[PDB]
């Protein structure tokens, strides 16, 4: 046989032609291990080769070097390791020159490079790599690919190793990553890749950020790229700014107000779902981190001593400007409605809750005016939001200021049970339950108890969820009895 048209078939559209050559060219795995890899390493290089051949090329080399399951990986790793220092030094060259000549998109080359990568360095057998890639981007005379392709590699390399191995390559690596994100940089495809690389790298550079010289610099570059026109890179930029926020909360005090708040609070109002999600996550993650510190304080306050680390209270401020987005976002909900998807309607509801449990008795006021103001609106959308928001804000706040609140709505909430809109129903049912779990007393009220239960029952023969919610309620109410004795 002749090795090209086979690779063409090594991934063909038919499950038998492929399954065939997928093994034929697997006999030379354990009976030709070396000799093979190389063969491809060149065909993967010479541009003359049709797409498939090339694409399929690295696919095989990539394949036989690494594994998905963190298990077998160990095995297929030492593989190219215990190999002959003859062909390795050969392949490692027919590939570092394949980039810039591949027309396709996710260029296979990046793949294999990274694969070999997690092994030619955890000991240091390929310490000439990093300087070479660096040259691909920092060098102004390089193809839109020559650059892209490269980064792609750098990114996989990070996404596959434990922090400890890359912690001292940072300076060398990062210097390149960021170069791909710069504003003056032409192709957004290079920018993109780069912004991704960062997402996988932030994880191991406490050293880098600790040096103000760089930090300032990184944050500048990330925020700039947050103003890039290509949606493709904005979602990348925010993802970093979100990761960074969970990662380096303490250092963010110098960027939050001048640069970050304006940026993240803006995004949330993006018509684009992907871009909003990111924005919400940010302030969502911020609460998480902040109310977590909130603990550090007390647990270390009763014991009588300085809190190891201190919060800076961002949610509290922006609270005013947040909610009136979170709430207004509790409207961009999917029609057909999928239950496991992650669209703003959720993030908003979720974050609207977390905030409600960190800011405490400060949220009650900023949210009410939206409920009263949307309990009657025609569009069900602005209606269920009203309910939902009332549902969210029941954790955190002191009951000695909710019990009274609910009661006034409690009644006009029951009427929402059989609200002509199917979504208002479901949500109205969900709240009720949440109003039994959190606040037991203020629910069992004669004034509207009799009219209550008689509507919960009525719900048992309704839609699953709803019914499967009246339970979250009846149950709760009962437990509230075994507790009062």
């Amino acid at each position: 046989m002749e090795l090209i048209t086979i690779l063409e078939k090594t991934v063909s559209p038919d499950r038998l032609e492929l399954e065939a050559a997928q093994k034929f060219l697997e006999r030379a795995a354990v009976e030709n291990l070396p000799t093979f890899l190389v063969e491809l390493s060149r065909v993967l290089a010479n541009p003359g080769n049709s797409q498939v051949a090339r694409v399929a090329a690295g696919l095989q080399i990539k394949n036989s070097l690494t594994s998905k399951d963190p298990d077998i990986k160990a095995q297929y790793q030492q593989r190219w390791l215990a190999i002959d220092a003859n062909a390795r030094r050969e392949v490692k060259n027919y590939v570092l020159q394949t980039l810039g000549t591949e027309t396709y998109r996710p260029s296979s080359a990046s793949q294999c490079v990274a694969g070999i990568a997690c092994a030619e360095i955890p000991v240091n057998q390929w310490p000439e790599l990093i300087p070479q890639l660096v040259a691909n981007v920092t060098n102004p005379n390089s193809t839109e690919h020559m650059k892209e392709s490269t980064l792609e590699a750098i990114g996989y390399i990070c996404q596959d190793i434990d922090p400890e191995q890359l912690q001292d390559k940072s300076n060398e690596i990062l210097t390149a990553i960021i170069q791909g994100m710069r504003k003056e940089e032409p192709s957004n495809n290079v920018k993109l890749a780069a912004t991704n690389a960062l997402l996988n790298s932030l994880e191991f550079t406490k050293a880098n950020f600790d040096k103000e010289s760089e930090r300032h610099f990184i944050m500048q570059v990330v925020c700039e790229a947050t103003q890039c026109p290509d949606t493709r890179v904005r979602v990348a930029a925010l993802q970093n700014l979100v990761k960074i926020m969970s990662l380096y909360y303490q250092y963010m005090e110098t960027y939050m107000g001048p640069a970050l708040f304006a940026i993240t609070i803006e995004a949330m109002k993006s018509d684009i779902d992907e871009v909003a999600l990111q924005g919400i996550e940010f302030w969502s993650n911020v609460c998480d981190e902040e109310m977590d510190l909130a603990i550090e304080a007390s647990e270390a306050a009763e014991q009588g001593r300085p809190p190891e680390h201190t919060s800076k209270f961002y949610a509290k401020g922006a609270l005013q400007y947040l909610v009136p987005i979170l709430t207004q976002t509790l409207t961009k909900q999917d029609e057909n409605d999928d239950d496991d998807d992650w669209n703003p309607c959720k993030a908003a509801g979720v974050c609207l809750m977390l905030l409600a449990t960190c800011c405490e008795d400060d949220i009650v006021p900023h949210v009410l005016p939206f409920i009263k103001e949307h309990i009657k609106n025609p569009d069900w959308r602005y209606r269920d939001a009203a309910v939902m928001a009332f549902g969210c804000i029941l954790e955190g706040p002191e009951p000695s200021q909710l019990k009274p609140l609910v009661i006034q709505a409690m009644p006009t909430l029951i009427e929402l049970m059989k609200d002509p809109s199917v979504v208002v129903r479901d949500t109205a049912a969900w709240t009720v339950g949440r109003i039994c779990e959190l606040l037991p007393e203020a629910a069992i009220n004669d004034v509207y108890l009799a009219p209550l239960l008689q509507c919960l029952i009525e719900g048992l023969s309704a839609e699953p969820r709803v019914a499967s919610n009246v339970c979250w309620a009846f149950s709760s109410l009962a437990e509230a009895a075994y507790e009062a004795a």
């Binding site: 996710p106 979100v242 998480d288 647990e299 992650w342």
Partner: peptide
């Protein structure tokens, strides 16, 4: 073809499970 990622998910305390929301979290 299945390249790397786009990852960024969350929902704290019973993460990617869905439903309207979850239950309380308490202390000492």
């Amino acid at each position: 073809y299945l390249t790397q990622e786009t990852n960024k998910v969350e929902t704290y305390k019973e993460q990617p499970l869905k439903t309207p929301g979850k239950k309380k979290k308490g202390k000492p």
